[PDB]
Each structure stands twice: as structure tokens, then as C-alpha cells.
Amino acid sequence: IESGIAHIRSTFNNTIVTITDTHGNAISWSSAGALGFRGSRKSTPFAAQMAAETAAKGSIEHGLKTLEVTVKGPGSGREAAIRALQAAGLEVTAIRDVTPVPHNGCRPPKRRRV
Amino acid sequence: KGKDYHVSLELDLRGERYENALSRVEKYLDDAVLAGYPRVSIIHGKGTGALRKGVQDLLKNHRSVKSSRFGEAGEGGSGVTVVELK
RNA sequence: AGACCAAUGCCAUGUACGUCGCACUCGGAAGAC
Predict the structure, then answer these.
(1) β-strand pairing of B81-85 with B39-43
(2) Is A112 helix (H, G, I), strand (E, B) or coil?
(3) Is B60 exposed, middle or buried (0-12, 13-18, 19+ CB in 10 A)?
(4) Rounded CA gap, B67 and B64, in Å?
């Protein structure tokens, strides 16, 4: 269990962190709610940053060194967690900006001010 | 008595090179030897590489610095290098 | 311009090259004269 992939969702309300194997097999995950943020505080970059090192701590004891990260959705947690990973001593080899961008997809929900 | 020279608490080295940054950083860190203070923060903006590694290594090897750590919410995240003085 | 010029114990003599880069986020309620 030497290499893995860390996936993080960067939403406007939360930031999930999950790690997996090249075979797409999960090991551990964390979140702002997992740590104890309940309100809008989950959206803060700090919550995602905390999420990063708890994920790293859940990762090391199974012995994985090299990572490369996929980021989903736009949010404040884009920059925090990715450098929190290398702050936690790990080594992330690539940054992938994979988000679902449908060509037309489905008609989005209604507006927020009607 | 150390009274004839003054010390500050913040470093500004916008766009400086490796060796010039070394020359200014060593002076900045050694200034507070006679007038110690809690810590300092470093900001540049952005640059063309990753000399943060060398700067952090020098700071961790610095004699008069107890340790170096990173920034909280009010310090541009944990990416900002913070030099914890004695 | 035009006199005289016979000779220099042994070794090894170097050093010498393959150069560049620092870091900040989007927003409650409020009636009437």
C-alpha cells in the first residue's frame, strides 16, 4: 500500500477528503463534519485543511507515501488542503482539476431569488 | 545595553534572488538577537520557483530560532512560513 | 657595409572544473403615518 490517490470535493458548504488505491480501492476518509464542524464553518478553508492532515494520519499507518490529488467542484478548500497534504509530510505528484462539466447535461435548478 | 539599533517584526523581500534573499534574511533573523520578539511572517506575492524549501531549511538550522512553524487563518493559511523565536 | 663567438651532468616540471530556483475567502429581518 505504497501509492494512492487522494480525492477532495471543494463545495461551497463542505470539503470531503478520501484516499484510494490505483485500483480505485478506498482506505480512509475525513471531513469537516467528521472532525466536528457543523455549521457554515465546514466551508472555511481551515476545516478542509484540518481534514487534510487527519486523512494523512489515517494514511501513513497503512504505509502509503506517494499521492496525486483530484479536486472536484469550486470552493475555498481548493488551495488549503492540497498544500496541507505536503505540510503533513506526504508527497503529492500531480494535481487534477477533474470536475463534471456536462456539455449540456440536465437543466439546472431554478434561480435563488424568485 | 542594546539601545542604539532598532528591530522590526516583519520581512519583505519581493522578487529577490536566492543569495540576496539569504543575505537579507540572515540579517533580519539576527537583528532580534539583542531584542527578541515572538515570531515573524514572510510574504512575497508570487515567484518563479520554490525557494521556500531552502528558506525553511535555513530557518530550521538557524541558531537563535527555537523553531519555525506555519500560519493560522489570519496568516494566509498554513502555507506562510512562521519563524518561532525563543 | 667587412678583428674575434670553442662548451653548458642526472630527472620531472604541473594546475585546469562538470554552475541555479521563494507563498491569501462572498453578504439575516425591517409593517404603517
Answers:
(1) antiparallel
(2) coil
(3) exposed
(4) 9
